């Protein structure tokens, strides 16, 4: 459609400046597989957006998990033999694995050898994450914040 390629998967509707954070925060550039990227691409729906094109690769739950509280409006879709075979939404599980870090500095998750983990109580306002260890809850605007 918008200039596809045999197999692989396209991540469309990425919010501006979030695109590049994905390539890194997800070792996406870790391959010999032809990748195409578009930053600050114009869009008739979000104003401006990012877009990644990973040739001969896929997701499902491996990472479309994080994409949730990241690109709440992104659109991941598989492409086979030049054709979109499945548009997807943000499957945003209530559980998030180790790629994350608890803000409570006195949480034992920092000192000891254990993969982080949060429960995601998605209030319609902002997103809240409760730590599996210290049990304190926060806002994803703090956990994902610098």
């Amino acid at each position: 459609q918008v200039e596809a390629i045999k197999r692989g998967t396209v991540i469309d509707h990425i919010p501006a400046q979030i695109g590049f954070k994905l390539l890194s925060l997800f070792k996406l550039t870790e391959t010999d597989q032809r990748i195409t990227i578009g930053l600050n691409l114009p869009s008739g729906e979000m104003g401006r957006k990012d877009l990644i094109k990973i040739e001969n690769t896929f997701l499902s739950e491996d990472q479309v998990d994080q994409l949730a509280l990241y690109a709440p409006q992104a659109t991941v879709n598989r492409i086979d033999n030049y054709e979109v075979v499945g548009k997807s939404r943000p499957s945003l599980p209530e559980r998030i694995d180790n790629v994350l870090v608890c803000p409570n500095s006195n949480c034992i998750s920092h000192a000891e050898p254990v993969s982080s983990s949060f429960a995601v109580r998605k209030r319609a306002n902002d997103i809240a994450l409760k730590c599996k260890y210290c049990e304190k809850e926060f806002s994803h605007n703090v956990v994902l914040a610098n």
Partner: protein, 310 residues
């Protein structure tokens, strides 16, 4: 066979109304009818990485009154994790090959939770993790309440002092909320106000609570006045303005209270409770602590006994 058999006791948040009065029922049974060898050949690890008199001493006494043996330490300055840099994980990993159960108090929140991921079939009991949870404290608290008031329903409860860092009131408020009609009064400095996640939970079950500036404005309505110490070992420098109590309870300003009113405090207390409150009929922090013995005795049996008839 009982519901608490072989279970970890980490957060009040993972317990049901039943579990609680199950341990209170056992406690009542045990205080009246003592069982000297309920766990004759058991070895329990008492591990304290923080400081404590009540929780650690009541716990070990409990193990002995039940015929069990105890190992452990009161500070980690001499463990391998204190001198050789060993992880908590590994410490829990090896201790779990020596004991039937592990009781531990640790300075970081979540340490108990982490422990259960390395203890295998060994049940872990949280004597308090940082400022998060203190389950066995509320178990004895509920027992004390049940005792003095004869009920755990629609009571007028007030919690005073440092509510932010009080693992004691964190766990106690979650438990009291599993019961019906209880009204809560929160009297604390804004800097140590009592966490949101607690209040939100109270809203989920839509139960009454409200902040107050003084004790006297709720004195005549409360059945339980739970006093607290300022956790001056857990607070940030940007909060040292709160080291001193703020609300100090004296005998005099206890005149308009209900006759059945009982003054509780997990202890230790510094200045928040004048010693002149001690000779009054309301003072109940010592009797309270004494109940730690029956409550923890009750827990140890339910966790280490498939069944027990008494």
């Amino acid at each position: 066979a009982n519901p608490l058999y072989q279970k970890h006791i980490i957060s009040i948040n993972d317990l049901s109304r039943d579990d609680l009065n199950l341990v209170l029922a056992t406690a009542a049974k045990l205080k009246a009818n003592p069982q000297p060898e309920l766990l004759k050949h058991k070895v329990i690890a008492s591990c304290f990485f923080e400081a404590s008199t009540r929780t650690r001493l009541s716990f070990e006494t409990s193990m002995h009154r039940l015929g069990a043996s105890v190992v452990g330490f009161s500070d980690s300055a001499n463990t391998s994790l204190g001198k050789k840099g060993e992880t908590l994980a590994d410490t829990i990993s090896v201790i779990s090959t020596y004991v039937d159960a592990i009781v531990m108090r640790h300075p970081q929140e979540g340490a108990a939770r982490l422990a259960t991921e390395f203890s295998g079939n060994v049940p872990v009991l949280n004597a308090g993790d940082g400022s998060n949870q203190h389950p066995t404290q509320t178990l004895l608290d509920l027992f004390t309440i049940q005792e003095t008031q004869g009920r755990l329903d629609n009571l007028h409860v007030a919690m005073v002092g440092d509510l932010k860092y009080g693992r004691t009131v964190h766990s106690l408020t979650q438990a009291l909320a599993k019961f019906d009609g209880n009204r809560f009064y929160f009297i604390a400095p804004d800097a140590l106000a009592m966490p949101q996640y607690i209040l939100d939970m109270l809203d989920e079950k839509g139960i009454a609570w409200s902040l107050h500036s003084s004790i006297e404005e709720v004195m005549a309505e409360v059945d339980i006045l739970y006093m607290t110490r300022v956790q001056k070992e857990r607070l940030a420098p940007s909060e040292y303005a709160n080291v001193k109590a703020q609300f100090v309870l004296r005998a005099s300003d206890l005149h308009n209270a209900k006759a059945n009113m009982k003054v509780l405090h997990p202890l230790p207390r510094v200045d928040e409770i004048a010693t002149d409150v001690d000779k009054t009929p309301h003072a109940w922090y010592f009797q309270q602590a004494g109940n730690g013995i029956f409550a923890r005795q009750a827990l140890l049996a339910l966790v280490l006994n498939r069944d027990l008839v008494l």
